[PDB]
Subunit: 390 residues, 5 copies
Amino acid sequence: TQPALLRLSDHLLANYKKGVRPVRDWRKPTTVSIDVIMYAILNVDEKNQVLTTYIWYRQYWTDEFLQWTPEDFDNVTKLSIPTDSIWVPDILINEFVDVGKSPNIPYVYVHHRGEVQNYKPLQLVTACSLDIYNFPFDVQNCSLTFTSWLHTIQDINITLWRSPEEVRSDKSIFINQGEWELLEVFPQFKEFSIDISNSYAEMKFYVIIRRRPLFYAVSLLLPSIFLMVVDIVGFCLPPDSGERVSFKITLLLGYSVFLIIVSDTLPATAIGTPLIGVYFVVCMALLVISLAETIFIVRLVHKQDLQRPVPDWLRHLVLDRIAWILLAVRGLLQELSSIRHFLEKRDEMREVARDWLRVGYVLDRLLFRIYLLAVLAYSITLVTLWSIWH
Amino acid sequence: TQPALLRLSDHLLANYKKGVRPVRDWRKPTTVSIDVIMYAILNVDEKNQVLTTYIWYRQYWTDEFLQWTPEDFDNVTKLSIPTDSIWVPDILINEFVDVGKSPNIPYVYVHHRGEVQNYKPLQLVTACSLDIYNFPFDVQNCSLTFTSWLHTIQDINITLWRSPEEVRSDKSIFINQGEWELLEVFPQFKEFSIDISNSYAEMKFYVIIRRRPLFYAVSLLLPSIFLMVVDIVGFCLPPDSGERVSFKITLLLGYSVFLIIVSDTLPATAIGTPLIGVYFVVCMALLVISLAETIFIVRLVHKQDLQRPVPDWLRHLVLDRIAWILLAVRGLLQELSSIRHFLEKRDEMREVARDWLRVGYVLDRLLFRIYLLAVLAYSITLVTLWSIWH
Amino acid sequence: TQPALLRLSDHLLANYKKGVRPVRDWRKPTTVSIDVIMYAILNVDEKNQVLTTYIWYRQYWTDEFLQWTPEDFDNVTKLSIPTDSIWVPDILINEFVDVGKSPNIPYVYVHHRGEVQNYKPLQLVTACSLDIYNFPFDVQNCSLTFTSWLHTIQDINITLWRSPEEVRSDKSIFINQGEWELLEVFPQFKEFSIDISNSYAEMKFYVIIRRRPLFYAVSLLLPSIFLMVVDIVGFCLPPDSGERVSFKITLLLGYSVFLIIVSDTLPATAIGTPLIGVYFVVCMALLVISLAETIFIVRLVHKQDLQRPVPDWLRHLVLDRIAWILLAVRGLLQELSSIRHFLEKRDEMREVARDWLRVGYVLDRLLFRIYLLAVLAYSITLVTLWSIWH
Amino acid sequence: TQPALLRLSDHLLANYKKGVRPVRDWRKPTTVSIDVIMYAILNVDEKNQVLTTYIWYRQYWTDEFLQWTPEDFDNVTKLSIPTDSIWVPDILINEFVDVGKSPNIPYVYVHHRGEVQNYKPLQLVTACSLDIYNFPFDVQNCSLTFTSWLHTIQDINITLWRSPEEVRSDKSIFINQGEWELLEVFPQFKEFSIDISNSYAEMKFYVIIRRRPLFYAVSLLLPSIFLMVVDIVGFCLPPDSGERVSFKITLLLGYSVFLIIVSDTLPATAIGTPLIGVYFVVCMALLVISLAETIFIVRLVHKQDLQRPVPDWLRHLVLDRIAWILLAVRGLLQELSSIRHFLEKRDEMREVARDWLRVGYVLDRLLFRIYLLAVLAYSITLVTLWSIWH
Amino acid sequence: TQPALLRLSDHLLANYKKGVRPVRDWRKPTTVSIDVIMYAILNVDEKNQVLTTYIWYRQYWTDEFLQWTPEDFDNVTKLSIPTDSIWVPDILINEFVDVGKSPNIPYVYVHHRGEVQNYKPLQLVTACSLDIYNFPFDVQNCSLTFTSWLHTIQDINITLWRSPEEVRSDKSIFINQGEWELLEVFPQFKEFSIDISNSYAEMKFYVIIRRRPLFYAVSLLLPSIFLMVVDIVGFCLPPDSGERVSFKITLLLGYSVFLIIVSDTLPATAIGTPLIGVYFVVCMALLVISLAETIFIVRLVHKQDLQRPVPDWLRHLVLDRIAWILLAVRGLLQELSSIRHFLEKRDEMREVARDWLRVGYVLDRLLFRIYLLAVLAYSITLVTLWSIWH
Ligand SMILES: O=S(=O)(c1cccc(Cl)c1)n1ccc2c(N3CCNCC3)nc3ccccc3c21
Ligand SMILES: O=S(=O)(c1cccc(Cl)c1)n1ccc2c(N3CCNCC3)nc3ccccc3c21
Ligand SMILES: O=S(=O)(c1cccc(Cl)c1)n1ccc2c(N3CCNCC3)nc3ccccc3c21
């Protein structure tokens, strides 16, 4: 007479207590079968070490009070029952540090043998240990531990809806083209217990994610390479021009402000700084070495009246070995003699300055070649290190 | 006797179970008809790849328990019933990554034949794949998938309130003068199923939005064009002035800090960087070429005592082809001869410096003309590329 | 015997259905009277085009079930009834894009003739079209539309508690000394309908707000005026000092970084950039013109050995019109003749350089006077434009 | 037989209506006594003019239905009753602009004569007029107004739990070592009414808070003093060095970027800018005056061939008053005469340059002393202004 | 017949009042035992002085109404009861300034003797006094005070689940690899009372946390050390080069912008600035002393025509003590005499300049050695200060 669904709901939900664990025998536990599918990785924050993810969570447990024979209710084998009208296990993650805002699913499926299926999306804000030692190429290993917060293993036990390999290989609906790439979700079962009898069943899903380094390529490689290129270009200025040192100090200031600004996007952790800091300080050291070379050559070639003739050893070395590597008539005569003396003194000072300038030019050429070779070696080493990771 | 609305509500809502799917026959599904109208696009986030929109959502389904004959209730054909007192389908979006804060509508309209109409505004925070390859002019294609989270197609099915063309052409109440322009909302129906029998009905609304490029015109074109203009202006400084290199390095530092600052507003994605990065690095390369030309000409024209006479080939080439393209009396005599020798040496050095300066000036003029032509060609290419898109 | 309030509440709220529209005749609508008073303008966001305001909202409608005769209840004419125990119209704003967090008022006043008065504070996050074409002095015109989300005009109709002039003139409790100044709140009634019979009653309150320009006076006028002042000061440096160009380029870099930083506080919209951008780029053009003038004069006065005597036309023009507007004895003789020749050549080069320097100085004086006049004219024009708006 | 608490709760809460104002006579009001204790000042935002505070709020009113004789219930004189089971006045603050997240207290104490005590912590986000005219040393005067949102003075009246002096002197549990120091909380009672009969009782607590200036001492005084010190140091460079103007312009750029950056932490209001802006622009004007003095002296001492002998008046003044304040033999003769003429011309130019350099040096010394005296006077004035405030 | 759990729940929760404190005798209090385990320190905020932590909180109290004999219910000794169906003490923290978002645990364990165990995770936003006097190495001492907000010690009393040593030594599940290291959690019991009879029981957990200084090592030590190194490198430039002062001022500008930027990450408090500010201003003073030395030596060695011969005392001192520490024939003769006079004057000026340059060079060498020794002493002092803390 009455609709089958209405009669079934009246038969089930009448005198049904939602605060009672649904077992006819209190000794057996309610085995909750669990399944997790990753949807998206909303945020990985290396500063506070929290991982924000969106997952599709489903679970099913056998409710021994929501049972009926289909033949008495017009052959209905399953129906939807509100989640607030039945007992629901309190399965939640240990790693929680903040409650996620997720849509509330008001209905759950109940079968004629008691199986209750609960589908629900969950947004998770979980704490994790984020090691950024390989920051541009780091692969993270985050853990999600689903366990009952109160019930022991003798009340609520947790298993997997699907085989572990199927959960591992599930990468169908994951949002992929973001910053973080999901590798696998590995489920593992352990019994957490710090007491002889208080054993708690937990299910650990090791969410393994790999960062995509192409995000930071333009941000990191381009400015440093550009500034080394302009350093090489500016090395060509003559040392005695009087502007080479200004060029070098301006370039060093530019690199310093670049490093200080990029430090806002480079994370840090307690165990250690990311390894690319070593490369950045190596580039800083190369720029400082270039500046020191410029200052030394400027010292060599600067023309001041205290200059003395180039020593024999320095002259021979630089200009040979390094080069091959690379009556009132008497009263009238006195005034002319004095004028000639002054001109000779000026000419001798000019010649000494010329010799020092030649030595400085040869040394500058040699040191520029050495610096170019060092820069090429550093770039080749970086390229060959990047290649093996590919 | 009693008011018609009160009697109707008592007749309907008495012994009415809100946890039961409203069908007299459990085999037929409840066909939920759906309609979506876009109101505003609150935020498009290219970093986390989430789209925030506000939509006006209405749905109607046939409730087979909320039926009456109007003649028995003073000819009432419809009435408002609280949303919490009736069964409501759990239609929600798959793309959800965060629950939106939207006003709660407490009433729904119910007709005398069971049709229940639910009007509700929804704020959506949905994940989408944002491709910014054409960042200033990119058109996005975001999907909204409305489906029942639990019920299969044999329980809840989804259709459209209006024809697909009407939903596509709906741009009436959309907030238009913002950053993002709505092109169309294209509805499509698919059956999502990863099981033989567990088929789920879904309705996909492809929200297609086009960015307005005029937002970033002042931010991008103006600084680069201004810095190229000042580069052209500063190219006029004489190479031997001793300040041209300082001008060029200061300009390069300014452009570098501009690029680093503007990188904070330029988004990036895993698949690739926006194409305007190519244009920006081309402008950087042009500035670097200008600096290298300045340094080369400074090398040519710098006056130092090691200068040798201009070679025959270089002199002929630059100054012709490129130009057309563009007794104690004897003792007295000795001192005078020495003075004349010193003056002649200084004059010869000055003349050699003059020849080198002339060659450098001619080369600088030619290279300035070439650089101006290259800049004009680049600007014309950019303008003609912008024209075809208009 | 029993307290009058208890008896009255038992008489009213017993067998009272809160899901029924309170009319004895379903044909007549419930006329809801609305009054709105602005408290504060929490935030006006020109980027996402959302307006955040706090208002004091009160409404009253005639409930035909909450009626009694005072003489039967100890002459009680009004009482407070919980808001959750009575029917409340679902009046809410169309412009909503996010739900506002506002305190919940648990009680409403009910009179003996059915009038139910609902007082409630509301925080509103509404979308609006913000035109910043006159950004420092722009007056905004935001609309708040109160209407029933579900009920048509035949069920719920909306009017005004007070006359439109009284609502317009209400500026008593508004927080005034903030950034935004409230001009008026203009109420207007319209019938929103996109169907023959589905007519919806709405009440539009045009919130008109004017920005106070004194916020940005120090932020905008002071840096630009200061940098023009230092440009005028630095124009006094001699062109041949060798540091005027460095001064000008440093000043231009400072103005560029100022503009880039201040762009973070200058909003932009799709329809167009704020008009003060024109003034800012005019200041940029004036600085660039100053730099170009400095470079031109440096070109004129720079002393290099390729200098030729000043042409007759240029000399006459600049130095008149612009100025008015503003035997071994023979062997001994040969060496002396050669020395005299060298000294004469050097003196002639020095004299040519002196003539060119004089011409450059006169031209620099004239162009400095012209630039000062142009700057004064620009400042006077800005002051006059500001005065007429006052 | 039964427990005393259970019997008392059954006697009280049975047939008890929580929607009725608890008075046997509706003519008398429920006098709510209010006490407020400040816990912490979470945030004072001068931009949006909102004050965030945490307070400990307690109130007690006489409930005439929750009365019993202790002798009938095992001498129980008080008990805890859930807040949701009794009538609670809707006392809330007018100044609210956002609802505060505060813990919910589920129990209230009820005495045997009806006194109901409600203890609750409250987080308040209230709008206030923040005058920052004395920004580093400003004392704010914020108002908290507790009143019933609906009930008039004939229904709910408000008084103080403690005497006003006790509320004023309460600074025990306030968090003190933060940025803001609490001076006093002054309670005042007023009757808010804009109608003859609609009088509302309100209680205003004037929260008076004084900012601690030691927060911004390092941020403001240190950079300006340091840049003044380096300005004084750089004033010692010789004017003819050719780098003094570059030093001054670099220093000016540094101060400009410092001011622009510190503007991000200096708030502004509609009524007026903070007074320390005057001091900052005075420092800026001092730096500009130093730059102008440097440029003027550079103009005086610059050596160019157009220099003319120092005028008699300038020479006398600067160098006295300011200083005290601080045959082929004839053919042979012609060539020597010409050489002597050239040397004499060069020597005369050098002597004129020397005289101008001496005048410039004396003037530079005098102006440096004047500038040092002005800087010392400004620093002394600032110190003596700070002393009187201490 | 019926399931044991259902019968037990019916026996307990029937006619059970959840608003009544569960004691058969109202004179005895409900002794709540408290245990707290720290999970993670989400955020320590020194600006607003708030501490955000996640803790695992469990409590148990004896409910005298939830008691049964196991033999009558199939030997059930414990069961799970919903938290909303029983009386729960209102234990919450005094230090709260904002409510934390934590998962809600819906079940609590109840034993057959009345013991009710409540497990719950809590996110705490508590105010604390953060002293950053030793900012890089500071250890904080934050207090968490658990007490009943309403009930006095005669109603609810608080003790510890475990011994204080066990609570102190608990560092098992704390997230350790973050910025903050947990030292211990020290529980202490006090009776808070400001009245003769209104005594409140409270339990204080002194959360003691130590910051890990390795976070800021790269951010602080590296830039200052690098800028000192480049200062030492640039000290080698010859004083008469004309670019040493420009190098020094550019370096000072770089250090100034570094300090201004790093001030954004250096917190400040009312009681005092962090001690590393002293070291930073010492580095500033060292750089300023270097600049002043450079300016002084530039003054000494600058060549201008007003130079006078080096005084006897200065010459002797610097060049000895500091060095050891480190007829028409007559008409023909007149012209030659005049030429010789001019050449002699120029030579004498050159010789005076040479002597002054020698003195300046010796003084510059000595002062560079002194500055290097001072820098080495400062670095050694910093290293030895860091060693003793290790
Ligand atoms: O044995 S313990 O007292 C213990 C003793 C010493 C070190 C440690 Cl680390 C633990 N203990 C065991 C589980 C557990 C728990 N969980 C119950 C199961 N679901 C998650 C919450 N919360 C707690 C909250 C506060 C204090 C203790 C506990 C606790
Ligand atoms: O007389 S008024 O209409 C009036 C007329 C003209 C200017 C002004 Cl400023 C007020 N009026 C008086 C109190 C009051 C009120 N409070 C009731 C007491 N608790 C706080 C809220 N809310 C309102 C909300 C909207 C409109 C009016 C009011 C209002
Ligand atoms: O004696 S007091 O009036 C008092 C008098 C003078 C200075 C001080 Cl500092 C207190 N007083 C004692 C406890 C207490 C309290 N707690 C009850 C126990 N749990 C936490 C909240 N809230 C309050 C809220 C407002 C006003 C007073 C109190 C208060």
